[PDB]
Amino acid sequence: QSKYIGTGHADTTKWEWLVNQHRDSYCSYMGHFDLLNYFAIAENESKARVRFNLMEKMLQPCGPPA
Amino acid sequence: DLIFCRKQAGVAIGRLCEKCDGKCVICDSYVRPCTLVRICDECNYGSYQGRCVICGGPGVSDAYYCKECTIQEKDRDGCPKIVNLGSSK
Amino acid sequence: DPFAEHRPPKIADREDEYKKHRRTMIISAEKAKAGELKVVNGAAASDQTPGATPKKLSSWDQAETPGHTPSLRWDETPGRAKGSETPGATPGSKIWDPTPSERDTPGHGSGWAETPRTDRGGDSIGETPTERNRPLSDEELDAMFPEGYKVLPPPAGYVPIRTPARKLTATPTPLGGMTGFHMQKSVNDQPSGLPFLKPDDIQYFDKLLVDVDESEEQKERKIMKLLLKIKNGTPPMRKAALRQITDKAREFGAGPLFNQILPLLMSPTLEDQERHLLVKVIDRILYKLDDLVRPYVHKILVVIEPLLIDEDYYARVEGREIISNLAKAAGLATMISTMRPDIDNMDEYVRNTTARAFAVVASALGIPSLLPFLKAVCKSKKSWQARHTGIKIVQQIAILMGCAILPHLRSLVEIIEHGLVDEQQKVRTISALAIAALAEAATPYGIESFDSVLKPLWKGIRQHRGKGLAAFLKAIGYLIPLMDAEYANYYTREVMLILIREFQSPDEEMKKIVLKVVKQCCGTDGVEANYIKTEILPPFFKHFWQHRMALDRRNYRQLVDTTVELANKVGAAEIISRIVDDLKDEAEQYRKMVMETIEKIMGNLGAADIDHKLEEQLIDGILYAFQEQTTEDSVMLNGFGTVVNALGKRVKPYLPQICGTVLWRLNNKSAKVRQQAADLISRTAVVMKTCQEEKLMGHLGVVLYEYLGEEYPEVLGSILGALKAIVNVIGMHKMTPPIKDLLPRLTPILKNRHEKVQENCIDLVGRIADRGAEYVSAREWMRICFELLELLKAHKKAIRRATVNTFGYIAKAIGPHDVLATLLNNLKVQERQNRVCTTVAIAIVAETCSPFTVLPALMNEYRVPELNVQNGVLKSLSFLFEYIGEMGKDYIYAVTPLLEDALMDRDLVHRQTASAVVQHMSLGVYGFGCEDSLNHLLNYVWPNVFETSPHVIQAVMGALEGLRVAIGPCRMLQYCLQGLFHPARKVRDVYWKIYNSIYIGSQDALIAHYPRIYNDDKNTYIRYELDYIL
Amino acid sequence: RLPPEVNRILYIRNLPYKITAEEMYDIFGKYGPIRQIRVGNTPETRGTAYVVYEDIFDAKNACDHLSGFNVCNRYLVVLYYNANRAFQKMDTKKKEEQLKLLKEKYGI
RNA sequence: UUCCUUGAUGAUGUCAUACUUAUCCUGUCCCUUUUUUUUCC
RNA sequence: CGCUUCUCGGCCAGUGUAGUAUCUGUUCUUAUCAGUUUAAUAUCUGAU
């Protein structure tokens, strides 16, 4: 369980849980080709610049911890 | 004292003895064999060539997984070669 | 003494002279170079310790990368006080000159010990130029005795007579005395007590010769005699007492414990069992205490390590288990800082074992943790004895970690090379030996990592005399498989010579070695056939095949192997030809050997090669052996079977001689040998068939049929077996004892109590009631039913196994209602009976006609007030759905309300088993669209979540996992939100455990189902993406 | 011709709590010179005693004849004392002086 | 303006009895083999 | 020994490893504050 990421425990902080689901949101968005294309259409960029941006936002999302 | 090695899942077909022969390994059960067992030659090697994935005797057959453990997708975790929590021999 | 007779078949010593020291064991950056001059200086002050300094500087080669951990490991090795001082000073000089470009006590006690042995041994060296009885000092005497005793004086006249005693022991040994009895309100019953105290054990449990309260520590010791309830007494006592100690782990603390065990795990008189149990206590408490055990660690191994050197296998494996549990349990630097000084300990034993220790601790904490230590050791320049050890360590690492050694292979070797050239011998010897073991785990690989090793080895091969020599072989041999048969080609061609010249030695270590080699050298693809045929064989069969060998165990095996592989190459008839003539050599173990060898060979190569005349010599042989069997052993029997099934219809001329013996033997010779011949038929059935010797099938059918009145179990068993295999060849309607005769004839046997019977019988009955099953009028069957029913008292699994499957077969023959009505007979009043396998009948039955029939009977039968049969019916549903799968899409409704009732309490068990039903249903239905109900049930499940009761819980985990796949997450997760953060601990514990189980599977799905979450000051928890609208 | 376990020590029990070193020294005195004795003077070990001789075979003759021997109305449990165990209350040491001494006089 | 009996837990006790795991009741011996190198056309 | 006649008799209290559930007995609702602890209690730890 532990070496399988996204594992929680009862000490789980708010922040960590949410950052988790961010990241996983992302590897989905890189995953599901369409969903990606959806984003691309909306906010006009490349597919690439999308994926790139995302892979920037990976570690950050929500901003610094507490 | 008795728990999985869960080292990475190789291509080596599993091997079971007389005793263990029917059992879908994790669901302990005879029901509905469908799909096939893989373990690491690390787990499975040498004196372990055709060794029981349980008891330490010679393998006469090949464990099939249940369907139950199938849809719960467990068969794909680390190689179910049970280690006694002493060494494996 | 006779009590010394039946008490010695209780337990027994098992040990050599050698292993009996156990009794003796009393309890517990060029300025990086000139820097090494510095480090050496300062530590040397804080004398002479080597491999310390090397564990220090051994953090060099990762350069830039060495850290705090240096203070950790070193922190234990030296007194953690000086630690800070040094490693601090170091880190300073290192960062800077990086710019500008009790333990100690313990070892002291060792150098003591050997300085002493030097003083004495030298005293008889000049005294010879001129033990336990060694006299004693009062300082020493006080320490040995525990606390709490006065020394005395009776009188200086009293102690003067004592002083006079020896001189007057000879003097008054020769003087006058004799003793005279005279012919002529007692009291004082001594309390010797509480399960029981052997006489010897008084010494330990003496304080249970006192009877008091109000003494506090001493109340903890005096309460820890719970042991004795471990050591001796009744099984239940052992159990309960055992837990009571486990939960009292944290409390009493290790110190008191091990203080009170290690005497017993040291007991000169200890058993087997008592040993093994007291191990159990050491493991079990070692699942708990972690930081705690530190001061005790060595003070443990000293007992345990001897476990490594034991005749009993299961002994060893326990030992290893706990030495990991300790080592991982304690800290690494604990283990090290502990275990240096045993390296140079005079006794080779303690080294030897000390290695295997380090092997284990290394399996625990990984090699690379431990390397720089080893690598330090093998470069210790004080003395070799270490290096002998450190190398050994490499080995036992090799053996244990085995196939997994692979990655650090190169480093390990990079240790060990510097040995081979050493001045001392052993160190050479052992070294190479390790290389061997390595390669034997390196199969096949890492060749060039060994690479720089060879060129000495080959040269070394030339010049040697002795055990070392053949050792180097042990290596090379295990190498060759690893080479390129062009390079390997050459090098091979060199060895097979020395191999030749060396067959002949008297050494057995040798013959093992050179043997296994040939397996490999001529065990090769890139070696030429004839060449073996000429040079090797005739020696081989000459010197090796001899009666020395086979009596021993290993040599037996290793031999068989080798000869086999020479077959796999030069062919079959070659070998077998030469060893046939020895089936008729008298002594068994030998015969047994030739026999199994052949068996394999015609296993692998196939019969097809064999000529004719030789073959006559086979079968004549394989009878002649088979006719004389000391015990009944699988060997000759199988070996035969394979012989025949290989020869196929080449066999046919030979039957009459076979079956002739088969019968003749079969009779007389009194019954012990009978079962054998029986089996012999078992295996050769198929051959009696396809060739179409039917008169034979008349013979067997009927004459076996007679024995089924034989009273010995161990015959009748094999008899039936023969019958079964006879059935699998000749079909039903051609059976010469036509079934009508037979099947009833069996029927009454089922009482037989004895095992092998019940097995082969129910097996047989099964085959026939499956296949023919019409032959026998129904009435007979229903008799069979009411006889089966109590076969379910079987201690064994397999009986019940096929038992059930039969129960089904007949249930097909007749039709269901009755047979479940009949199964439905098992009741809640008893329990062990109709424990479950019966339920399994209800299941399989319920398939084998449309279950769609049977339910109403079943369901209704949950009405009955008798509790345990109620839960029975629940499981019935369980296995039931597990066995039906898709079909559940119907009767689901039927059960659902019932699941509601049972799932609502009466008691746990209802909720447990029922919940299981939910599981197997929930998988089976999957995605046909019946969720709705399953949602409904989810409710009555849900509250069960909370309990400690292991079966109830792992049941529920079962439930919700399956239910996940049926309902889908999103619904689940909608039960698991609120739980996560709930203030309490209890709930969070669980709702997390659930949400994990949801989480791992279907992580990919979730994304949708995390709800919106409002972003706070420092952060944004709203995922803005999804709201982009075109 | 001896079992290895037995040692110059014997555990000795079934004693009265009045009983005399005079009695003791005398009786045990038969087999050989006493290295020394201890008597449990303590709440628990009142009733028992240890005995140690200048030789084992002394003690062997002891556990031989004194086996189950009588004193007062009592029978004395007579056992070869175990060893190792709890002693390490006293740390190993005291070498340095002494082994320098043999180092010195005899020079060896 | 001058009046009744009662419920319940928790903690500590080696009492008592039901029961749970297709657990268990047969597999199983194999690298413990250790010594101051020392087997002669 | 065979045949015929007559008389009598026969048959269609197992064991081992892990673990839970449930009764009864015994002790406490009893003075303040400081820490540990708990969802909150409780419980545990000190002195008047």
From Swiss-Prot, chain A:
Disulphide bond pairs: none
GO terms (BP aspect): mRNA splicing, via spliceosome; positive regulation of DNA-templated transcription; regulation of DNA repair; regulation of RNA splicing; U2-type prespliceosome assembly
Keywords in alphabetical order: Acetylation, mRNA processing, mRNA splicing, Nucleus, Phosphoprotein, RNA-binding, Spliceosome
Keyword Acetylation: yes
Region annotation (Interaction with SF3B1 and SF3B3) ranges: 1-62
Location of N6-acetyllysine modifications: K3
Subcellular location: Nucleus
Molecular function terms, GO-annotated: RNA binding; splicing factor binding
A GO cellular component entry from the record: U2 snRNP
Protein family per UniProt: Belongs to the SF3B5 family.
Role according to the record: Component of the 17S U2 SnRNP complex of the spliceosome, a large ribonucleoprotein complex that removes introns from transcribed pre-mRNAs. The 17S U2 SnRNP complex (1) directly participates in early spliceosome assembly and (2) mediates recognition of the intron branch site during pre-mRNA splicing by promoting the selection of the pre-mRNA branch-site adenosine, the nucleophile for the first step of splicing.
Name of the featured protein: Splicing factor 3B subunit 5
Native species: Homo sapiens
Biological classification of the source: Eukaryota, Metazoa, Chordata, Craniata, Vertebrata
Full-sequence range covered: 15 to 80 of 86
Swiss-Prot record, chain B:
Phosphoserine found at: S88
Region described as Interaction with SF3B1 and SF3B3: spans on this chain: 29-45
Binding site for Zn(2+) 3: C24, C27, C66, C69
Effect in UniProt of substituting Y30C: No apparent effect on cell growth, localization of SF3B1 protein or formation of nuclear speckles
UniProt: Zn(2+) 2 binding residues: C17, C20, C52, C55
GO biological process: mRNA splicing, via spliceosome; positive regulation of DNA-templated transcription; stem cell differentiation; U2-type prespliceosome assembly
A GO CC term assigned to this protein in UniProt: U2-type spliceosomal complex
UniProt key word Transmembrane helix: no
Site (Interaction with SF3B3): V11
Subcellular location per the Swiss-Prot or TrEMBL entry: Nucleus; Nucleus speckle
Residue ranges of the region described as Interaction with SF3B3: 73-76
Keywords: Acetylation, Activator, DNA-binding, Metal-binding, mRNA processing, mRNA splicing, Nucleus, Phosphoprotein, RNA-binding, Spliceosome, Transcription, Transcription regulation, Zinc
Binding residue positions for Zn(2+) 1: C5, C40, C43, C79
One annotated GO molecular function: DNA binding
Family (UniProt): Belongs to the PHF5 family.
Description of how the protein assembles with itself and partners: Component of the 17S U2 SnRNP complex, a ribonucleoprotein complex that contains small nuclear RNA (snRNA) U2 and a number of specific proteins. Part of the SF3B subcomplex of the 17S U2 SnRNP complex. SF3B associates with the splicing subcomplex SF3A and a 12S RNA unit to form the U2 small nuclear ribonucleoproteins complex (U2 snRNP). Within the SF3B complex interacts directly with SF3B1 and SF3B3. Component of the minor spliceosome, which splices U12-type introns. Within this complex, interacts with CRIPT. Interacts (via N-terminus) with U2AF1 and SRSF5; acts to bridge the two.
Protein name per the record: PHD finger-like domain-containing protein 5A
Gene assigned in the entry: PHF5A
From Swiss-Prot, chain C:
Site residues, Interaction with RNA: P199, Y313, C761, Y775, L867
Effect recorded for T105A: No effect on interaction with PPP1R8
Residues modified to N6-acetyllysine: K56, K280, K288
Domain of life: Eukaryota
Species the sequence originates in: Homo sapiens (Human)
Designated name of the protein: Splicing factor 3B subunit 1
Signal sequence interval, chain numbering: none
Keyword terms: Acetylation, Citrullination, Isopeptide bond, mRNA processing, mRNA splicing, Nucleus, Phosphoprotein, Repeat, RNA-binding, Spliceosome, Ubl conjugation
UniProt site (Interaction with PHF5A): E318
Family as reported in the entry's similarity comment: Belongs to the SF3B1 family.
InterPro entries (alphabetical): ARM-like (IPR011989), ARM-type_fold (IPR016024), PP2A/SF3B1-like_HEAT (IPR054573), SF3b_su1 (IPR015016), SF3b_su1-like (IPR038737)
Major site of localization recorded for this protein: nucleus
From Swiss-Prot, chain D:
Keyword set includes Transport: no
Family the entry assigns: Belongs to the SF3B6 family.
Residues modified as N6-acetyllysine: K18, K30
Superkingdom assignment: Eukaryota
UniProt region (Interaction with pre-mRNA branch site), positions on chain: 5-18
Family matches, as SMART domains: RRM
GO biological process: blastocyst formation; mRNA splicing, via spliceosome; U2-type prespliceosome assembly
Pfam families per record: RRM_1 (PF00076)
Originating organism: Homo sapiens
Covalent cross-link site, Glycyl lysine isopeptide (Lys-Gly) (interchain with G-Cter in SUMO2): K18
Gene Ontology molecular function, alphabetical: mRNA binding; RNA binding
InterPro entries, sorted: Nucleotide-bd_a/b_plait_sf (IPR012677), RBD_domain_sf (IPR035979), RRM_dom (IPR000504), RRT5_SRSF_SR (IPR050374), SF3B6_RRM (IPR034150)
Location(s) in or outside the cell: Nucleus
Keywords: Acetylation, Isopeptide bond, mRNA processing, mRNA splicing, Nucleus, RNA-binding, Spliceosome, Ubl conjugation
Subunit organization: Component of the 17S U2 SnRNP complex, a ribonucleoprotein complex that contains small nuclear RNA (snRNA) U2 and a number of specific proteins. Part of the SF3B subcomplex of the 17S U2 SnRNP complex. SF3B associates with the splicing subcomplex SF3A and a 12S RNA unit to form the U2 small nuclear ribonucleoproteins complex (U2 snRNP). Within the SF3B complex interacts directly with SF3B1. Component of the minor spliceosome, which splices U12-type introns.
Domain RRM: 8-83
PROSITE patterns listed in its UniProt record: RRM (PS50102)
Protein name: Splicing factor 3B subunit 6
Acetylation recorded as keyword: yes
GO cellular component, one term: nucleus
